[PDB]
């Protein structure tokens, strides 16, 4: 019940958040179940640009970072501050075609066609859920990266042998079944964005207890010092 | 000689932010000129969202925000944050067109559509300098209202009586003649988006204590104590 980065209790993380806002209803609140502190998340994104840092210090061109939109721009400007290493960075949109047989990732064909020529190239996304667009986008660009701050499970994703290669740099894993997250980036149906937390609506107390259980242990246990320079 | 935020003396600030890098050289250092720490931009940033929650304390439907790719990312994500009322957030990828009479943004045709459509459009940008965007922008989304952390020369703007009516939100002005500005999510041809404080690359140092002069009388006199809620 405490913010594992701060020592705030989260009814004082939250009291604070809540305070007079205009973009939720006072009745509305008891529905948002905090996962992660916004600073949390923080601690999350700079522990992944320690490890792709040490990756890539040796690198001799610079990397291709993209981001999908629109969710992971927040996830990308936490990240990047904190890169030490050379890359370029734009952001793509996609979309998810659901077909009888699969769900493909449709990439604009000049974006596809750019990626595709870069040796090194990650993907940037805040969120890997099913995991169906990883699968996707591996098929389309196979010498893809993925880096996104949560991933709901990996195992899931290395069951597929094509992704058994494929390098994920991930801050954070696993994430609970049967939540829906909103918050950190991620729309409740277009709103709240910027909520910067990461907030679930569909989990038990008890779930979202044992969630932060797991996290704020593997918060604590981290060392980030120094990579925050700012 | 200090952060106008922290306190921080800039030395040590640029000491701290150089330390074992991969990504510059040890004689390139030298070349980037610190305008802006990263606290002192989220303090701006924090400046105008306070602004805009105010203005928009009371909106009946969520506020249309439309971020300027690529540079915008992180200033959107350092605004965005802190909002306190209702919009929707989507990055549009525009084209600078340049013709023999003038340059005009190109927008994708649905993202122009869509946007014609609601009444409250917020076009957000780290950086308003030449302005021939917002020219461009007003001429095809009249109602459209900018919101930027940095204007190069605000009574610039205003000189075109189509823009005189236009609504800005902004951080900061004006920026120093003849700057370039690399950091902040700009790019330094391409590089170094993520370098998080706001350097300059064309002006002498004391051109650049100068600013820092009227930057810090500003943010010395800023009021945004308790926007952030984190
Ligand atoms: N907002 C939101 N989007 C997605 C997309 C996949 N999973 C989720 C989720 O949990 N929340
Ligand atoms: N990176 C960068 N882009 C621009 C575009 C206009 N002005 C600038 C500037 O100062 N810096």
């Known amino acids: 019940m405490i913010c594992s980065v701060t020592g705030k209790p989260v009814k004082d993380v939250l009291s604070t958040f809540f305070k007079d806002r205009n973009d939720v209803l006072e009745s509305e609140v008891k529905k948002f179940h905090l ?3 916004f600073e949390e998340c923080k601690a999350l994104a700079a522990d992944t640009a320690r490890r792709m840092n040490e990756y890539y210090k040796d690198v001799a061109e610079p990397v291709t970072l993209v981001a999908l939109l629109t969710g992971a721009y927040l996830y990308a400007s936490l990240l990047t501050v904190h890169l030490t290493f050379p890359y ?3 952001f793509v949109k996609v979309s998810s075609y659901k077909g009888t047989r699969q769900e493909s990732v449709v990439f604009d064909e000049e974006d596809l066609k750019q990626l595709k020529e870069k ?7 805040e969120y890997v859920d099913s995991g169906h667009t990883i699968f996707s986008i591996q098929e389309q660009i196979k010498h893809a ?3 996104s701050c949560f991933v709901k499970d ?3 994703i290395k069951k597929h042998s094509a992704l058994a290669d494929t390098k994920m740099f991930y801050g954070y ?4 079944k049967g939540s829906w997250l909103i918050g950190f980036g991620l729309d409740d149906n277009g709103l ?3 909520w910067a937390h990461l907030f679930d609506i569909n989990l038990s107390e008890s779930e979202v207890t044992e969630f932060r259980r797991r996290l704020t242990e593997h918060i604590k246990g981290l060392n980030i010092n120094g990579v925050n320079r700012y």
Chains 1, 2 share one sequence.
């Open 192 to 194: 709240r964005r910027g």
């Open 145 to 147: 990266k993925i880096c």
């Open 154 to 156: 990996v195992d899931a």
């Open 88 to 90: 370029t960075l734009h």
């Open 173 to 176: 894993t696993p994430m609970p």
């Open 119 to 125: 040796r090194e190239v990650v993907l940037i996304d």
């Open 35 to 37: 996962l992660a502190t």
